[PDB]
RNA sequence: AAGCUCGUAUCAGUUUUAUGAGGUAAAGCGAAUGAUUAGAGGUUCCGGGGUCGAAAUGACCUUGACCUAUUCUCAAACUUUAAAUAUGUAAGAAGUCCUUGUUACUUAAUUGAACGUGGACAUUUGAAUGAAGAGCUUUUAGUGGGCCAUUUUUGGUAAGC
RNA sequence: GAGAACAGAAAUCUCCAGUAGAACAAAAGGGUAAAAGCCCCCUUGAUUUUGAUUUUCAGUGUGAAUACAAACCAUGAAAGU
RNA sequence: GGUUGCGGCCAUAUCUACCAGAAAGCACCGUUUCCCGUCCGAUCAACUGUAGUUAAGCUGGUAAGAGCCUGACCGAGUAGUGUAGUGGGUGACCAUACGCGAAACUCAGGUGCUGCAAUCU
């Protein structure tokens, strides 16, 4: 990804943490009392479970997809790359996120984003998200 | 408003932290007794420190709480020593205040080389009437914000009667 | 197992009538892998009773074949002919319990035409033979009666 | 090696119910038991004296005795291929009256009614219970409600 | 309150609020449990408590029993009933406590039958005694002191009430070591002193000792005793008569009332805010984001 | 094996209805505990650095910790919630209602509690299905190396373990 | 958290917040807030007699435990324990 | 309807901020001879009900408030699960048939009900 499209082209997110410890019966005794010591770690992963997640400019699609393709070879067992309906790491499909943003409703935050809710204190809700409360641009 | 949400002194508590027990301490006791009238209480070390030279439950300090007229007499009398200037700290967020004075002689009280010289901790806890609500046995409740003592109100109160200064920022 | 006993089906290709309520419906549910069942028509209840129908009379299992055999044992409940019997069954009469228990479990032969299907122990719906197959129960039972 | 003490395995059994720790409310003590009352059993972990063993947790029994702070409950426990009679000295905090009969009792009281109400009219009763009958014929109308036709949907991925 | 204080979602979510009557600092359940519960082999037998409570100057006396729907007043006597009897001043005091206790005993014991039989000590030399069971006859009415939150000090007037209910005829099991005039340093009751409190001896001797050592104060408090020409000495005959009057007719006179419930109803509604409707509340939001938002 | 006492009777590796109990699967983690990736905004008379400095309970940068609202990820010995399968009791004559005897227990109390006497109502008498009947007693053999299959499942890389 | 001479990260004094995040000999899990934790006061029921009961179970023993009966006591104003 | 004393269920009663409360009641509040307890009459004890106050307690109302309670074909007949097959697949696993069926989510509605006795414009 970086050599082909630059170190700031994209955002790679390993979406899976190896929390499960693998045991080992290292080696007089035979099978007598054979409870392994820790050997290494591993993520336990599902069907449909996402493993890598990446965000870019649409105009980089291939470069990302070829990256995920090449990483595939690094793994046991079939995985398949999927183009998302969602806007980046957000929870929203590209239109719904556009409708919410080009409304008021959406506000920047470090890497992610915050959304105005109709719930809570009217007061400090008008604080945050000033560019709402007009209902246009 | 105010009618009866006045501003009294709940109590005055003097405190002598001594590094130790024995004579030096029991003398520091005597001071508080001849200065409170009341017979003072003794505090034991809460754990051990060894660079303070103190073993758990050693007796390490004495102190006394004084309430009503007696409290004002002493307050002023040390407030004298402190030339009626305190500091924007001193006054706690909850509205009490305290100050220290070394040399207890600097407020009436003669000398006696068999008693020595001690420094004191003065600490004034303030409240308004109806404090009882928090403190009584039945139907214990809490005082509402428009009654709770504050820093602002106590400094104001202070700056008035006594006619002392607050200093600093 | 237990259920198959309580419905008196303790050997292959034998059959009995069952009045449908929640409390038997569940029983049916419990034994679907092992049975084939459905809604029988007048025609197949008649020919079931006329040909393979036997009474339980101080046990023994006595052929029907004369009407006094029925009046004797079922007469207490109205019911004094082989057709009175059929009539009680099919209309699920007020006295269906007695009428139907009187009937000794029918004993069919294996189907003449065969089973349809190359494997019996899947559900009807999956190309098999077991379960509720509804009105298609008459085609079968006839081929076994 | 193994461990099999009295309250073994009971971590969450005797455990106390979310946000419901503390004093037991006073009605648990104003309740009143007589011999023959049917009671359900459940241990209150907060009351350590007079507590049922875990096997009797979830179990229903009949009262056979009443003492100052307790009731004696008989339970049939089946050990082997046979039941035996067990008598349980329980404190009132671990017992409650069972509802397992309220439908019966309610039904008798009412069965007595519908009967007298019938008898002294002109018979016709029918007061045994009956299972769910299959439903009857019915004519559903279209008027206001023509059938909407669905089909199955294609594969999609949203993610 | 203070910013860095205050509470989280978490905190309030997992909070187990106590019983109301504990949040109110009113009911000590630990003892209520132990006051109320009955021997399980005594079935529906109620466990009547004699509840004594001191307001800022009313004495309350109820005989109460328990019921899982709520408790139950058998009988009730408020020390403000003492004007009916010849007591007008100091009704928060020890002798009022006694009187009111006495009123409660007599009153119920009346409405219970044991009116004639079981009179208790008519004399009152304050000797120590509970009321003994008559020979072949009804056992007396048994009742237990619900001090409530009161501290138990040897002198408390909570036990003043106990004395008059038990001098009145109730069987209220009790010991002597919290009656005024109980010697700390010898298991011994001076009864010449407890007689003194019953009739209000400590109050009158005060009244005396002010009548020549300060009449600034003696007029301030003890005002009303002037206003009705009752100087000390008579304070015993006051209460000694109170006892007579009380015994002579305890049957509780309700107040003549005036104005119906329906009336106290309507006038009190005048000062009662009623809630709002969501439609109404919705209109307070919209209205707010009319103003606070659209650039003033 | 021998039977014995009875028999429409009482009986059930089953359903149904009513009423309990349970903390597994799943789920959860911008809910407690424990773990875990990322930033964003705060807060220091106060963890250390550095510029100004005579210092400052000095100001300005800075990295740490903490706090706030967010974000990716987890648990046999975590958890608010919480299944399916299994599981306790109940579905009447040993039942329901009236009248009012016994006692040394128990009540303030012939109040209660227990046990009763006298009277009112039959098989739609109180769900389903079945019942080559049900209950009971004595005595005695062999056996006390087990192995396999589906599913659940521990140790082991694994095993025809 | 905020406050008070020496006094410092940690001594002793005060106020505010505080669902237990503590303590309850010990392993761990339950349990507990006007307590079951902390301080004080009075004590020996850690006693006497002999049965029933629950767990383990053969429904033997042993250990441990539960609810009563008959005593004598302790404490508490008391209900009680 | 208010308020008190004793309650039952124990958050629709709790929490945060603010405002309002007539009458009675609670309350705060005065005092230190007496019983009683404290380093301290603050707590606790007693005495007055007199000398004062609705400031606090208490009660209620406000809040696109926190929390909590309820509901719904909101999500979802989803996850999971009892049962079947000489079903698919190298396996890992997965469909299908007859059944049972969550939790989160999302949206809406709500924010103490009530027993006994006394009292009150
Ligand atoms: Mg070897
Ligand atoms: Mg090896
Ligand atoms: Mg090992
Ligand atoms: Mg691969
Ligand atoms: Mg005022
Ligand atoms: Mg020193
Ligand atoms: Mg049948
Ligand atoms: Mg043919
Ligand atoms: Mg052929
Ligand atoms: Mg042919
Ligand atoms: Mg074939
Ligand atoms: Mg043929
Ligand atoms: Mg083990
Ligand atoms: Mg609690
Ligand atoms: Mg014990
Ligand atoms: Mg916080
Ligand atoms: Mg939050
Ligand atoms: Mg107590
Ligand atoms: Mg478990
Ligand atoms: Mg799981
Ligand atoms: Mg998972
Ligand atoms: Mg969940
Ligand atoms: Mg977590
Ligand atoms: Mg999310
Ligand atoms: Mg788990
Ligand atoms: Mg079952
Ligand atoms: Mg039959
Ligand atoms: Mg037979
Ligand atoms: Mg044998
Ligand atoms: Mg043998
Ligand atoms: Mg043998
Ligand atoms: Mg062998
Ligand atoms: Mg422990
Ligand atoms: Mg308590
Ligand atoms: Mg011993
Ligand atoms: Mg032996
Ligand atoms: Mg007023
Ligand atoms: Mg004194
Ligand atoms: Mg005072
Ligand atoms: Mg007092
Ligand atoms: Mg106000
Ligand atoms: Mg109050
Ligand atoms: Mg809310
Ligand atoms: Mg399944
Ligand atoms: Mg098979
Ligand atoms: Mg298979
Ligand atoms: Mg699936």
Using CA atoms of B78, B82, B85, B87 in order, give the dihedral in degrees to the nearest 10.
-90
List all residues 6 or more positions away from D147 whose beta carbon is below 8 Å from its beta carbon: none
**Which chain F nucleotides are covered by protein, judged by CB under 7 A?**
12-24, 30-32, 35-40, 57-58, 67-75, 79-81, 87-92, 95-96, 106-115, 121-122, 124-133, 155-159
Q: What is the C-alpha to C-alpha distance for residues E30 and A133, in angstroms, rounded to an integer?
A: 55
Distance B32 CA to ligand 38 centre (A): 21
Distance C56 CA to ligand 7 centre (A): 15
Straight-line distance from the first to the last Cα atom of chain C, in angstroms, rounded to the nearest whole number = 25
Q: Give D148 to chain A, closest Cα distance, Å.
A: 29
Joined together, the tokens standing for residue E136 give: 């072949």
Q: Do chains D and E touch (3 or more CB pairs under 8 A)?
A: yes
Do residues E212 and E218 lie in contact, with contact meaning Cβ atoms separated by under 8 Å?
A: no
Q: Which chains does chain B touch, 3 or more C-beta pairs < 8 A?
A: E
Q: What is the C-alpha to C-alpha distance for residues E197 and E157, in angstroms, rounded to an integer?
A: 10
Nearest to E176 by CA among E128, E104, E111, E218: E128
Distance D17 CA to ligand 23 centre (A): 20
Q: What is the C-alpha to C-alpha distance for residues D127 and D111, in angstroms, rounded to an integer?
A: 7
Q: What is the number of H-type helices and E-type strands within chain E?
A: 12, 6
Q: What's the sign of the alpha-carbon dihedral D36, D40, D43, D44?
A: negative
Joined together, the tokens standing for residue C42 give: 């007048």
Give the full edge-to-edge strand order of the sheet including D70-78.
D83-91, D70-78, D60-66, D38-41, D95-97
To what resolution in angstroms was this structure determined?
3.0
Which residues are E75's β-sheet partners? E63
List all residues 6 or more positions away from C70 whose beta carbon is below 8 Å from its beta carbon: C55, C64, C79, C80, C81, C82, C84, C85
Q: What is the C-alpha to C-alpha distance for residues C38 and C132, in angstroms, rounded to an integer?
A: 5
Q: What is the C-alpha to C-alpha distance for residues B4 and B10, in angstroms, rounded to an integer?
A: 15
Joined together, the tokens standing for residue D103 give: 């439908």
What single DSSP character describes residue A81?
A: -
Helices (H), chain E: 9-13, 20-23, 29-36, 94-111, 158-167, 191-199, 201-210, 215-220, 223-227, 235-248, 261-269, 278-291
E154 touches strand H (CB under 7 A): yes
**Which chain H nucleotides are covered by protein, judged by CB under 7 A?**
1-2, 4-11, 13-23, 25-31, 33-37, 39-40, 42-68, 83-87, 91-94, 96-99, 107-121
Using CA atoms of E169, E172, E178, E183 in order, give the dihedral in degrees to the nearest 10.
60
Q: Which chains does chain D touch, 3 or more C-beta pairs < 8 A?
A: A, C, E
Q: What is the C-alpha to C-alpha distance for residues A56 and E47, in angstroms, rounded to an integer?
A: 78
Q: What is the largest CA-CA distance in chain E?
A: 92
> Residue B2 CB: number of other CB atoms within 10 A?
8
Find the nucleotide nearest D14 (Cα to C1′). Answer: G30
Q: Which value, in Å, is the radius of gyration of the alpha carbons in chain D?
A: 26
Q: What is the C-alpha to C-alpha distance for residues E3 and E80, in angstroms, rounded to an integer?
A: 49
> Residue B149 CB: number of other CB atoms within 10 A?
21
CA angle E74, E76, E112 (to 5 degrees): 45
E30 touches strand H (CB under 7 A): no
């Amino acid at each position: 990804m970086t050599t082909v499209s630059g170190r700031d082209a994209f955002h790679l997110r390993v979406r899976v943490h190896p929390f499960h410890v693998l045991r080992i019966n290292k080696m007089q005794q035979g099978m007598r009392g054979a409870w392994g010591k820790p050997h290494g770690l591993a993520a336990r992963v599902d069907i449909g479970q996402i493993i890598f997640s990446v965000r870019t400019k649409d105009s980089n699609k291939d470069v990302v997809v070829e990256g995920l393709r090449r990483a595939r070879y690094k793994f046991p067992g079939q995985q398949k790359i999927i183009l998302s309906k969602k806007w980046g790491f957000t929870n929203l499909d590209r239109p719904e996120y556009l409708k919410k943003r080009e409304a008021g409703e959406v506000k920047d935050d470090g890497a992610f984003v915050k959304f105005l809710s109709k719930k809570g204190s009217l007061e400090n809700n008008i604080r945050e998200f000033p560019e709402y409360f007009a209902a246009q641009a | 408003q105010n009618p009866m949400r006045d501003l009294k002194i709940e109590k005055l508590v003097l405190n002598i932290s001594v590094g130790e027990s024995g004579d030096r301490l029991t003398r520091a006791s005597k001071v508080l007794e001849q200065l409170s009238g009341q017979t003072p209480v003794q505090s034991k070390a809460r754990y051990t420190v060894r660079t303070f030279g103190i073993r758990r439950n050693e007796k390490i300090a004495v102190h006394v709480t004084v309430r009503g007229p007696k409290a004002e007499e002493i307050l002023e009398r040390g407030l004298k020593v402190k030339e009626y200037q305190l500091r924007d700290r001193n006054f706690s967020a909850t509205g009490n205040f305290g100050f220290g004075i070394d040399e207890h002689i600097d407020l009436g009280i003669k000398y006696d080389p068999s008693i020595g010289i001690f420094g004191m901790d003065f600490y004034v806890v303030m409240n308004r009437p109806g404090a009882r609500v928090t403190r009584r046995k039945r139907c214990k409740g809490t005082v509402g914000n428009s009654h709770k003592t504050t820093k602002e109100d106590t400094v104001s109160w202070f700056k008035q009667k006594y006619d002392a200064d607050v200093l600093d920022k | 197992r237990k259920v198959l006993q309580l419905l008196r089906l303790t050997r292959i290709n034998s059959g009995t009538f069952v009045k449908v309520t929640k409390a038997t419906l569940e029983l049916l549910k419990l034994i679907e892998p092992y049975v084939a069942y459905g809604y029988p028509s007048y025609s197949t209840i008649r020919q079931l009773v006329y040909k393979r129908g036997f009474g339980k009379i101080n046990k023994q299992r006595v052929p029907l074949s004369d009407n006094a055999i029925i009046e004797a044992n079922l007469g207490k409940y109205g019911i004094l002919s082989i057709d009175d019997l059929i009539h009680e069954i099919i209309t699920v009469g007020p006295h269906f319990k007695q009428a139907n228990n009187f009937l000794w479990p029918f004993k069919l032969s294996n189907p003449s035409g065969g089973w349809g299907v190359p494997r019996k122990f899947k559900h009807f719906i999956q190309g098999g033979s077991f379960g509720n197959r509804e009105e298609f129960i008459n085609k079968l039972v006839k081929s076994m009666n | 090696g193994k461990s099999h003490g009295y309250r073994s395995r009971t971590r969450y059994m005797f455990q106390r119910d979310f946000r419901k720790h503390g004093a037991v409310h006073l009605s648990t003590y104003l309740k009143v038991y007589k011999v023959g009352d049917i009671v359900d059993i459940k241990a209150n972990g907060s009351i350590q004296k007079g507590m049922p063993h875990k096997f009797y947790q979830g179990k229903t029994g009949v009262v056979y005795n009443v003492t100052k702070s307790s009731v004696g409950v008989i339970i049939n426990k089946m050990v082997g291929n046979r039941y035996l009679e067990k008598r349980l000295n329980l404190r009132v905090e671990h017992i409650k009256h069972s509802k397992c009969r309220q439908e019966f009792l309610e039904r008798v009281k009412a069965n007595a009614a519908k009967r007298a109400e019938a008898k002294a009219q002109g018979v016709a009763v029918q007061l045994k219970r009956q299972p769910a009958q299959p439903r009857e014929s019915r004519i559903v109308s279209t008027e206001g409600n023509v059938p909407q036709t669905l089909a199955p949907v294609p594969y999609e991925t949203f993610i | 309150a203070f910013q860095k204080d205050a509470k989280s979602s978490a905190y309030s979510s997992r909070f187990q609020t106590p019983f109301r009557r504990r949040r109110e600092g009113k009911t000590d359940y630990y003892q209520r449990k132990r006051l109320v519960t009955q021997h399980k082999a005594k079935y529906n037998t109620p466990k009547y408590r004699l509840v004594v409570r001191f307001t800022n100057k009313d004495i309350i006396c109820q005989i109460i029993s328990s019921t899982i729907t709520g408790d139950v007043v058998l009988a009730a006597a408020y020390s403000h009933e003492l004007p009916r009897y010849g007591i007008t001043h100091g009704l928060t005091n020890w002798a009022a406590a006694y009187a009111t206790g006495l009123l409660i005993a007599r009153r119920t014991l009346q409405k219970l039958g044991l009116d004639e039989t079981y009179k208790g000590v008519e004399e009152v030399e304050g000797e120590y005694e509970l009321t003994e069971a008559v020979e072949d006859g009804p056992r007396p009415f048994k009742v237990f002191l619900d001090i409530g939150l009161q501290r138990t000090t040897t002198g408390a007037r909570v036990f003043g009430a106990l004395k008059g209910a038990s001098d009145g005829g109730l069987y209220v099991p009790h010991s002597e070591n919290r009656f005024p005039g109980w010697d700390f340093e010898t298991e011994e009751i001076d009864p010449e002193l407890l007689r003194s409190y019953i009739f209000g001896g400590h109050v009158s001797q005060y009244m005396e000792e002010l009548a020549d050592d300060d009449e600034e104060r003696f007029s301030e408090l003890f005002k009303g005793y002037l206003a009705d020409d009752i100087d000390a000495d008579s304070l015993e005959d006051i209460y000694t008569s109170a006892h007579e009057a009380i015994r002579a007719d305890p049957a509780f006179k309700p107040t003549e009332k005036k104005f119906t419930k329906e009336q106290y109803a309507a006038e009190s509604k005048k000062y009662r805010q009623t809630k709002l409707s969501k439609e109404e509340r919705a209109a307070r939001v919209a209205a707010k984001i009319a103003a606070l938002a659209g650039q003033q």
